[PDB]
Amino acid sequence: KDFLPLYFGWFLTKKSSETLRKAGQVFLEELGNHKAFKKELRHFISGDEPKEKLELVSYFGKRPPGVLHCTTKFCDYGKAAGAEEYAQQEVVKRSYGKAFKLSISALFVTPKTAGAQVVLTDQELQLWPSDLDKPSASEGLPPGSRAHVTLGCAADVQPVQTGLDLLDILQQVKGGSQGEAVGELPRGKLYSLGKGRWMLSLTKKMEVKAIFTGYYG
Numbered sequence: 001k002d003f004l005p006l007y008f009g010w011f012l013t014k015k016s017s018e019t020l021r022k023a024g025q026v027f028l029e030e031l032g033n034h035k036a037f038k039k040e041l042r043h044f045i046s047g048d049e050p051k052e053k054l055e056l057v058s059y060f061g062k063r064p065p066g067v068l069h070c071t072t073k074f075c076d077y078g079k080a081a082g083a084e085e086y087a088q089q090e091v092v093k094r095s096y097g098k099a100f101k102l103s104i105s106a107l108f109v110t111p112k113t114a115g116a117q118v119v120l121t122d123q124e125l126q127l128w129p130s131d132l133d134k135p136s137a138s139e140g141l142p143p144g145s146r147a148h149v150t151l152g153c154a155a156d157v158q159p160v161q162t163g164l165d166l167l168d169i170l171q172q173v174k175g176g177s178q179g180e181a182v183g184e185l186p187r188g189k190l191y192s193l194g195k196g197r198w199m200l201s202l203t204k205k206m207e208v209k210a211i212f213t214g215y216y217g
């Protein structure tokens, strides 16, 4: 019998990866230099500390090397629950190797991860794994809300954290707790959601090109 991928997803082209990666780093630069962020650094550095500034690019030291991606289904070669069902779908097999455009609507930062929120079209939503055997997965939010691109992680943080972070952030925006924007960056508005959580809503959605395929490690 045949190995499944470690995970399925959309893998950005060289150019799109470069473009999104640069946007993420610029965001980390501006955020770290933003007065509202520094006023709340108690959520990134603990204890009575010298009043210095944190370089977020350095903070998120575990970064994706090379090509960026948006995961759909983690399969672990077929060991993960629902892995085979997902892989056997017609739409997954039909879409394998095909090009897509992913709309990135926001960039976010928590004390654990940094990433970009992806807003899937309905065609692309067809490639999002069914939560019907684990509605814990998407936590009351529309399907595919977890869709993201990871831009960086803190040293002690597991890779899957980014998706959980995004859902947490979106969960607040659902209850209307993003509050009044606390800053206006060149690319959009900065929101302070508390607990070291920050969201930049892009004025203009970023459009990235990516191939849907499988990663085998």
Ligand SMILES: Nc1nc2c(ncn2[C@@H]2O[C@H](COP(=O)(O)OP(=O)(O)O)[C@@H](O)[C@H]2O)c(=O)[nH]1
Binding pocket: 007, 069, 070, 071, 074, 080, 149, 150, 159, 160, 161, 162, 163
């Ligand atoms: N999404 C997801 N990832 C898992 C799960 N269990 C383990 N992982 C980890 O996810 C890693 C690969 O995820 P990755 O695509 O890099 O993270 P993402 O880009 O934030 O979705 C692997 O190293 C696994 O150890 C799971 O149930 N779901």
